Amino acid sequence: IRVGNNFAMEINLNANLWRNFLYSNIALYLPDKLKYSPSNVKISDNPNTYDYMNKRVVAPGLVDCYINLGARWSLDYMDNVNPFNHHRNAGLRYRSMLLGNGRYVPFHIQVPQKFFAIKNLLLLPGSYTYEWNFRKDVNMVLQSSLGNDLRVDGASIKFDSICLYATFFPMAHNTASTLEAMLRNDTNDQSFNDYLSAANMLYPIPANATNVPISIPSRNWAAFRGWAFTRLKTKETPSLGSGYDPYYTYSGSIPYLDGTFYLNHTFKKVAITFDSSVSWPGNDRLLTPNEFEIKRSVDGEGYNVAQCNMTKDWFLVQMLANYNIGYQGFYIPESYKDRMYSFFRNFQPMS
Amino acid sequence: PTHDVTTDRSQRLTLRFIPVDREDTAYSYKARFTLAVGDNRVLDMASTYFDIRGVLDRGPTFKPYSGTAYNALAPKGAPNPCEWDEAQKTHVFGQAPYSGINITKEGIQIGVEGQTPKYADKTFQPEPQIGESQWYETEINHAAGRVLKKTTPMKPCYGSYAKPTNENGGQGILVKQLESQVEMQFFSTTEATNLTPKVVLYSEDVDIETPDTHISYMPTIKEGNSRELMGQQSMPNRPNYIAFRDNFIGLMYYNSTGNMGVLAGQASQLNAVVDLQDRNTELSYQLLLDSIGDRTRYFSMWNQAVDSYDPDVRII
Amino acid sequence: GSIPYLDGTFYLNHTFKKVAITFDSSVSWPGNDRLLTPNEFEIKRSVDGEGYNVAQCNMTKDWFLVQMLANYNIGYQGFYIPESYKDRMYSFFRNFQPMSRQVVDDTKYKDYQQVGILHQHNNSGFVGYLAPTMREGQAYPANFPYPLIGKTAVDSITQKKFLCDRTLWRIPFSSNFMSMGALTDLGQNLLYANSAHALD
Amino acid sequence: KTAVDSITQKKFLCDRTLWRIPFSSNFMSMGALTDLGQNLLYANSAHALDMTFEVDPMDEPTLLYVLFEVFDVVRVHRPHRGVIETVYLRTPFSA
């Protein structure tokens, strides 16, 4: 017979589930400057190897169950880390399981055509050659959720066969010949436009560099539409224009090619000066009309929006660049104008 | 409408196009086709695509799951039943979960066949999954279990795997002469040394491995089994999802002037694809699908599954 | 339980291989060399020696074209995600979820042993044997399943399938498999015809 | 009641997006061919551009990805069976 209360041991379950959440998702994905090498474990010398990224032991006290309690706050350590190189990346989580669960995968893929002239083109009758160059680089054809070099890590791909398919609408022959005759005029030319509609230049920024001056030499600027700038990483961006990049030891998400941009918060200001004396937009337009102050560290005059450090000039421009919102009041744009890659869908102010 | 919309003649819907001439570099390959559109047919090039077959090796650094596969409910510092040589005597840290009837020199009696004592098959019996089912600590005079030998390298239980080498699931390194080497080790009470052995530990050599875990705490750099290597603690490897990219980015050379594609007539041979390397055809297609459709939805045929971080992981 | 005949909770859609439709006992429908295998509606293929599967599954290119044209008028100008009002609950693409896995290749992997459920001892001394009852055993290295990843990954074979619940395999009686009206163009040719046709 | 003397840090994160600055006189989209883009057709003069970005310092070589938004237009003519003819034009950055 037990004399008194029974024996038991107390656990904090919700804290242990929340301490497992913050470690597996945030503390293991910290920058490598916060980690250290474990004792008595042979670790690889190459930092782009999975044997490195797995075995760099991180302290749980860096991101433990008490970090920023009651603060909706992304870590300053984790702002510059690619959030799409993560195992909760639900696209890559879906794309990994769409092939299978094993190392050795025989695949069967249908690759879409993306070149805008020949993407929506309605071909008329005729025999055409149709010749395409395909990649085989395992850091380009594949995507890992850690960003390790898949050339060193033994990932191989081997393209056995290939076929071109083409679905034809079975149009009536005296109707598909009237449409054929109409579409062979010089007045009925099928005209297309690239959706990005931009000539894209990559300018290098050195390490720990604050000032980035670029310079377009001299040109007629007629039919110019605007700018759309974003910071990238040299590690994460392959040298396109070359068919094979031997210095590209990275197989994570490529923000240059997929739209997974994340270094937008690393911009302070933008000074656009046409022809070295004409500041743009000039004309005393903005509250600081010679530069596009994107954020302010030290604000005494109080020109910030949204309980963050983004300025009132730059929040006006970005709500007008995307939604025509800003001269008749700021409000939530509707869900059809506010797409996935838009400004307001992703603007998340924190404090 | 009846007529003037759909033909009444023998016309195919989908055509199959064998490559005319394929050439290979060490980093790229090229596929020339004849995109032959017959008489009175229109072809929207949105309906055209490349069907590619092949063999993908994801490499050993592919881990499609968090945690481990083997003994996940085990404690991370929990060792397997192992042996080691100290200073040269061999110590045994083991467990004997099975409860039998009688113990002779042939092993443990698991039952009878009439009056003949049926013993345990040393290849797979007693099973390390079968022990006692009641919770109260009854008297167990004739227990038995399985122990890894001193030649087997010592691993924690969390994440340990050995392949089975018989039909009945028993794991153990077979040797050629193809007979297993499972030695029997008889143990009795220390103050008892008639002599009746209480515990029979079937020692064995398994092909032990940690296919998805690693050690987070090594107490000893030296080789060989030791008492300090019971305290080694196993951590699961980090999950690495290796796959093709969203909308098959990186399979087709866009905006490479050396790897430009060709759509031309067979006679004039003037390439209608004029490609410029300061275009981003990939990002032009990633932003086009956003403006025309709900981008959160998953379309497997074009591998249309958008990269999306968890919103509670980025912003804590 | 749920009655799929009445509730609309259809779930055995994946158990179809092919469909052969013949009008008047000789005229194979649709005829006209329409499909890639034009004498039948191949819904799925396990062999796939000629290269006729979509969606990284085993559904054929003929059948995925027909189902995206029966519901959505999508397929002749490129396959894309249908808009959210065309894609209802009991529709095709809302419910079509293609899958794949790898299992062991028992005829190629030289160390395969078919270990039944009586002898699979993963979570050995921490999980009750063959029951949700109390634990029994010892903290012992597992033997199931075979590792598909790592440096010691087994020789694997890939199984592909799809599950498309809640839906009906629509084959429209139209000459281009599209919905250009409720009274289809092949139903108006047989209109005022006074001709009976056998259907097999 | 024993709270420390605290200082407030504010920031924003805006992923997945491009910082759009439209080349329009009121920063709005009244059309793809903007009014400042037509003001430079009738001016008929070449101007140089000197943009200057101030960024946060990172311990890593980074790149700058500026989209100079143009009209990347292709007009496709097929006059005869097997004949394909295309005229490309993008303005300003013609190539």
Partner: peptide
Amino acid sequence: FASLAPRHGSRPFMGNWQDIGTSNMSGG
């Protein structure tokens, strides 16, 4: 071209006249 259009009732279900071309660009 009313023989190519589906018949809602006895009237041809035509589209609009000005819905022929596209005009979408990256913000414009």
